[PDB]
From Swiss-Prot, chains A, B, C, D:
Species of origin: Rattus norvegicus
Full-protein interval shown: 30 to 253 of 323
Topology relative to the membrane: Multi-pass membrane protein
Domain comment in the entry: Aquaporins contain two tandem repeats each containing three membrane-spanning domains and a pore-forming loop with the signature motif Asn-Pro-Ala (NPA).
Protein's name in the database: Aquaporin-4
Cytoplasmic topological intervals: 60-63, 72-85, 147-154
Glycosylation, residue list: 123
Recorded GO MF terms: identical protein binding; water channel activity
């Protein structure tokens, strides 16, 4: 294709690779099958700051999409070619798969948790889990577009942190609801490795619908 | 009215809608009627970063008032028309009501907590609870006005975060005292949904008095 | 004196008033005489973000000294008149006293803790407690001078946050050692109200020595 | 040599001195030989914000290498003379040794923990512990180079915080795996003081390999 382009695909692969390794590696529970204590502030800050870090390392060389729903919302909003966008999802889907892969064999025998495979419960349906995802991936993609929107009062402070903190507060609520994915490839990675696919469809359409509707709302409504 | 104006009312509705859903949804206790553990750092960071996020998404399109006491202090300080300010409170009061609404049916049967309805105890009176609120909503509105005040040394770092962190440290103290509302509509939302109105008046006048006195102090005293 | 000057004294009084109320009010243990759980991350973030907030509200109108050791290091480094500096300590010493004052009667009957009066133990001597303070108030005053030093690469990000985070990591270690004061007036306030003065001298000379040596090192050595 | 140069060596000595004292002093467990509770968010935020603080105090006068692997990656990437780089490691290796030193005698008799000597377990091998380190010190050095790279969109927000948050999320995962060193001198300090050298080689080559490969990837591949 283009060296520029294929660097960015690389950057996209490595970035998911570290995101899901570092932050999924936080879901790890050192007291596997008791107990926890189940620290959200840990899991939550990990996953947000990890993204805030990754966009800081790679933003300038890929975009820091690092999330297929963002990629879908990018294309649906006309920002990335239809063909450019297919070389991202896969690089994001292999990056996660070998991010969790690498993780699997470096974490000991306490992984039992399922490496943290987003799994919808609390007794909720599929539509609830759809919604909880739809809604947050929204709040999150809306953060990305608002903060990354030229011709504004050069938004105060770290753009990476905003997009981080969005992931955060997003985990800071949804974790027991849905897994708090808001990211198809983030849940595609471990699903492959452990074979657990319970309600997996829910983590593609949920986050994608929310991604578009928040791509949409910025572009054609609010601006 | 004006499309500009009515976008901002929309932005105001959606923003409370996500604020109270995401952050009130954090007050949720996964061990309802035991136990907790009652993580403040969770509830606290959630509520601050949520606001820091919302002002980041919408600040540039509404103001990120997202709080009637701020709206009252805005008008009392002559910043927003008397008629503009009535289309905010209601949009903030419906936004909260359907923010909690949406929440009610996505959270399972562990909500028992009361979706987190600010309720004044610790054995305190009503005047204490008035004060604890009055005081913090002050500290908070004073942050908003200080940080959002043109003709200054273009204050270092994220203005959203400052206003976030103010909410934070504000929760980081008052939570067991008062609920740590510092926000009438934030406590108007759930009150409607659950019917629990214990000392509700206390969350309008407290935060409003504090809002004005901190709107006042900036405008006519300190500057 | 001068309205400008006496505004700043006011700003200095109010700022300690909120700092020690909000953050000392975090040391409060809702399970007084069991139990805790003794959350440092709570106490720690409270005290740092509180300062980060206060400098954000008042920095532009007083300096955000909000700490006599800083005031002593300011004067010792020739930055503030000898007479200007005496109207700060007292405004900082009344501000704390009525900050804790106001707190005393708004917190219920769980205050037993001593409103959080910095008290040197762990079995340590007085010189250890001197040092642990001396050292941190150093690390902290060195942050203040480094970050607040014109003619630099206009330091990245919130100057308030840096100075906040310094307080933080400072509490994030010293809390069980010394109380983690690094601030004479912060421990002058509650000491007055509760009458507990155990090793109180240690919180003036410790933090002041550290304040100077870090005022000194910046001014006459490192620069 | 040069006063400029030897100031920076000083700055390098003092900075590790405070980093390892403050943040290693956080690993301290007030319930030594039970129990903990083992707060990661504490240890994690301490170690990141400590670095974020140190680069803020000294960055402008040394570089804020404060980590031999960074120093090796700096030289391997041609940024620092071979002779300049030897006066850093030692200043970083004495700074840590007397940082922990000073700590040893200020912490009481609850230090038992080993002052927090990075020690590779979870049942992992040496190559796993190599990798977990190799990988993170990578993620971390890549943050340093990306954020500190002139000719970019003057990266949003605190550069110190980015480099802080990288340390953070880095601890936020690896702590039970490896100790989460990502820093040879940080683990050289306490090793000297307590005599515990279990897998110590692993904390030089791991972090150094990762340091280079992430120095390399930025310089000769991604840019
Ligand atoms: C498969 C992914 C799911 C599809 C998303 C559903 C929404 C699609 C419809 C929509 O509103 O998107 C906007 C519409 C506007 O794009 P234009 O640039 O005008 O297209 C012309 C150049 N080819 O996008 C058109 O695709 C559809 C698909 C969008 C998702 C991208 C799919 C790539 C991954 C495979
Ligand atoms: C392996 C091939 C990796 C190739 C490396 C880089 C190129 C990336 C694109 C290649 C596509 C990768 C697809 C292979 C994934 C294999 C897979 O599906 O995983 C199955 C899954 C299920 O089995 P276990 O849980 O192990 O159970 C064992 C019995 N109890 O796990 C099996 O490993 C391997 C998982 C992936 C490999 C992870 C090992 C680390 C190797 C990669 C590190 C390299 C990083 C940087 C180089 C990238 C270029
Ligand atoms: C606007 C957005 C438009 C684009 C978004 C989505 C595209 C829509 C197509 C897929 C949506 C329908 C999929 C549902 C079919 C799967 C299903 O329901 O199977 C049943 C169910 C049974 O198990 P449970 O009831 O959970 O528990 C066990 C009890 N015995 O199985 C659950 O899936 C997994 C099946 C794996 C599917 C995941 C693979 C990926 C899905 C493709 C989505 C792709 C979207 C576009 C991306 C571009 C690339
Ligand atoms: C009802 C809300 C409670 C009222 C707040 C109490 C304080 C009011 C008095 C005060 O000091 O406010 C300042 C005073 C200055 O405003 P001007 O622009 O000069 O008014 C002329 C144009 N109409 O404000 C005047 O209203 C009162 C009400 C302020 C709150 C706004 C009410 C909107 C919601 C209903
Ligand atoms: C419902 C109508 C929602 C209309 C949507 C958008 C327009 C916004 C302005 C309309 C004004 C809304 C006022 C209706 C609020 C209803 C109410 O007072 O709630 C009562 C309260 C008490 O009863 P329960 O706790 O359910 O007990 C059941 C028996 N055990 O709860 C009852 O739902 C509904 C609560 C509100 C609806 C929430 C459902 C989600 C629907 C809205 C989602 C749409 C979002 C975006 C579109 C906005 C435009
Ligand atoms: C300067 C600021 C000026 C503007 C600020 C405030 C406006 C002042 C008017 C209202 C203030 C007085 C209200 C007090 C009357 C309510 C009352 O005390 O009722 C008693 C008490 C009995 O219950 P408890 O003792 O708590 O426990 C049960 C034991 N059996 O009831 C408690 O309310 C709830 C009643 C619901 C009131 C909330 C509705 C909103 C109030 C309106 C405030 C509006 C302010 C202006 C906003 C502009 C729009
Ligand atoms: C009492 C507070 C403790 C004193 C601190 C100990 C160090 C003092 C010696 C020192 O090195 O300080 C530097 C020296 C340089 O100041 P100049 O501006 O040159 O003085 C001439 C104008 N009057 O400061 C001179 O005071 C002493 C006292 C400094 C603390 C201020 C005391 C105010 C509170 C009472
Ligand atoms: C009271 C006077 C407050 C004057 C207000 C503002 C002006 C500030 C400078 C005045 C100097 C203040 C010195 C008075 C401090 C009194 C004192 O030493 O406290 C003693 C201490 C020990 O006794 P208790 O613990 O209560 O035990 C009771 C029996 N079991 O506590 C006793 O209150 C009062 C403490 C101070 C008053 C706090 C009450 C809140 C009043 C002030 C709020 C006003 C804020 C803004 C206005 C400032 C201008
Ligand atoms: C360079 C820095 C120079 C300036 C810094 C400091 C100024 C030095 C003067 C004061 C230093 C010596 C003070 C020590 C004397 C107090 C003492 O040791 O008393 C004994 C001890 C006995 O109790 P314990 O052993 O702890 O436990 C009970 C067991 N039965 O008492 C403990 O204090 C409290 C006495 C209260 C003193 C606090 C009042 C403030 C002190 C003034 C310092 C002022 C510095 C300058 C500030 C400018 C304004
Ligand atoms: C001993 C430290 C371990 C060595 C690191 C292993 C990698 C070394 C090989 C490498 O790729 O580094 C790049 C190569 C490029 O440097 P130039 O400036 O071209 O050298 C000419 C001026 N003398 O570096 C050359 O050293 C080796 C050593 C690098 C580490 C520095 C050692 C200092 C501490 C002792
Ligand atoms: C001591 C000499 C310190 C010299 C100060 C500054 C100059 C820096 C370069 C000098 C090189 C320092 C090398 C000496 C380190 C000594 C050592 O290896 O430590 C051994 C180790 C093992 O024994 P223990 O655990 O104590 O067991 C006791 C029996 N149960 O600990 C023994 O102390 C001393 C440790 C180092 C000294 C720490 C004391 C604090 C003194 C330094 C503070 C000064 C700071 C600023 C000045 C720097 C210039
Ligand atoms: C590209 C990077 C190139 C530069 C990087 C590294 C340089 C490589 C040289 C050293 C690497 C080989 C070292 C391994 C030899 C040590 C060893 O394996 O000993 C065995 C093992 C036995 O104990 P365990 O099995 O853990 O448990 C007890 C069970 N009875 O001992 C464990 O070390 C400690 C020995 C201390 C070594 C640490 C001293 C520092 C090492 C030097 C590295 C220097 C690198 C360059 C830095 C420049 C300055």
């Amino acid at each position: 294709w283009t060296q520029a382009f294929w660097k960015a695909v690389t950057a996209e692969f490595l970035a998911m690779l570290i995101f899901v390794l570092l932050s999924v590696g936080s879901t790890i529970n050192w007291g596997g099958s008791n107990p926890l204590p189940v620290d959200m502030v840990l899991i939550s800050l990990c996953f947000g700051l990890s993204i805030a870090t990754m966009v800081q390392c790679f933003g300038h060389i890929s975009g820091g999409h690092i999330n297929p729903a963002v990629t879908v919302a990018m294309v649906c909003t006309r920002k990335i070619s239809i063909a450019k966008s297919v070389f991202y999802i896969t690089a994001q889907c292999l990056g996660a798969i070998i991010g969790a892969g690498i993780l699997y064999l470096v974490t000991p025998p306490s992984v039992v948790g399922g490496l943290g495979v987003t799994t919808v419960h609390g007794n909720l349906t599929a539509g609830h889990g759809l919604l909880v995802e739809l809604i947050i991936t929204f709040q999150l993609v809306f953060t990305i577009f608002a903060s990354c929107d030229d011709k504004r009062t050069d938004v105060t402070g770290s753009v990476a942190l905003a997009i981080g903190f969005s992931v955060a507060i997003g985990h800071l609520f949804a974790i027991n609801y849905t897994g708090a994915s808001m990211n198809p490839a983030r849940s595609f990675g471990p699903a492959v490795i452990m074979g657990n696919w319970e309600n997996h469809w829910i983590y593609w359409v949920g986050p994608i619908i929310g991604a578009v509707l928040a791509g949409a709302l910025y572009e054609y409504v609010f601006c």
